[PDB]
Design a protein around this ligand. Structure first.
Ligand code: HEM
Ligand SMILES: Cn1cncc1C=O
Length: 292
């Protein structure tokens, strides 16, 4: 398999990355109108996941390391429709801090978004290094939404995620919304879609879901409250193993936060070899903690 060794941007340390975090966090606060006042947090979380979710454990292709989303093949992946909004948000940040690698910037955008939306602290490591256009993974490595629990389980084995990690990661679907023009699905998953909570699990268990067709002729699960779940989301309450874990997170906010933090860091670091003398993971302070 390919080896990708983390290489710290020359001379940089925690303070440098905290400044980048702060610039992203301040722009998140500033650009509040986006997507009918949802703001950019959810799309930045999705971007960090999609740049990581191309990874294949079998040969170490894809993954966040190479920053390959910047290349046309990947940014034009139909699975990535709408993420251009996140990329455009990050452009002025990259211009201000041209020394940060693209993979570091995209992954840090996700960490910053989660924390600024009052989610768990996500430790983050620097050292992703931009790789050439020919290292861009082909389209088709990101998951389909119209599938069942068996599909989800098998899909995530490629990313070395187990049942607990899958169910934890999926809690991010509390955030933002599906947009018909991007993915052929429409609607939010709950009421608090720019604040990071365990609402995804509570809504799965507590809403009265009806299997309906949307205006793109795709099936999705809809509630009277105006929420929606993808078939792959709903599969987490159809499969008995996933259901137990859904119930656990619906009943323990802290446990969900801790497990999401671990799985999300792991997702963002898949494929990267960290030297034994690499810096420890950074835990950034939020703007609120800094009084900014
Ligand atoms: C079976 C796995 C998954 C499937 C099939 C899936 C599918 C989707 C789809 C179809 C959308 C709507 C995109 C749009 O129309 O704009 C979406 C949105 C989103 N996804 Fe996932 N997803 C999966 C896993 C994940 C994971 C693991 C995360 C992160 C931990 C994540 C984070 C998000 C976020 C934050 C949004 C909202 C984006 C926005 O509001 O712009 N998803 N997902
Ligand atoms: C609302 N939703 C349901 N599944 C995914 C999403 C995006 O947030």
């Amino acid at each position: 398999t390919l080896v990708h060794v983390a290489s710290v941007e020359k001379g940089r340390s925690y303070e440098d990355f905290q400044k980048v975090y702060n610039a992203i966090a301040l722009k998140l606060r500033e650009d509040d109108e986006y997507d009918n006042y949802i703001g950019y947090g959810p799309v930045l979380v999705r971007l960090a996941w999609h740049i990581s979710g191309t990874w294949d454990k079998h040969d170490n292709t894809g993954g966040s390391y190479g920053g390959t989303y910047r290349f046309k093949k990947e940014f034009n992946d139909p699975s990535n429709a709408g993420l251009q909004n996140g990329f455009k948000f990050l452009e002025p940040i990259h211009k201000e801090f041209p020394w940060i690698s693209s993979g570091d910037l995209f992954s840090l955008g996700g960490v910053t978004a989660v924390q600024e939306m009052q989610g768990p602290k996500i430790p983050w490591r620097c050292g992703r290094v931009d790789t050439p256009e020919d290292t861009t993974p082909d389209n088709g490595r990101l998951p389909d939404a119209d599938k069942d629990a068996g599909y989800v389980r098998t899909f995530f084995q490629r990313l070395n995620m187990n049942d607990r990690e899958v169910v934890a990661l999926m809690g991010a679907h509390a955030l933002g919304k599906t947009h018909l023009k991007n993915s052929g699905y429409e609607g939010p998953g709950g009421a608090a879609n720019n604040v990071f909570t365990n609402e995804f699990y509570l809504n799965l268990l507590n809403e009265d879901w009806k299997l309906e067709k949307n205006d793109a002729n795709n099936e999705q699960w809809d509630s009277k409250s105006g929420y929606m779940m993808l078939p792959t989301d709903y599969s987490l309450i159809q499969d008995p193993k996933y259901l137990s874990i859904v119930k656990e997170y619906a009943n323990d906010q802290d446990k969900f936060f801790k497990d999401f933090s671990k799985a999300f860091e792991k997702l963002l670091e898949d494929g990267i070899t960290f030297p034994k003398d690499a810096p420890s993971p950074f835990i950034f302070k939020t703007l609120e903690e800094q009084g900014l």
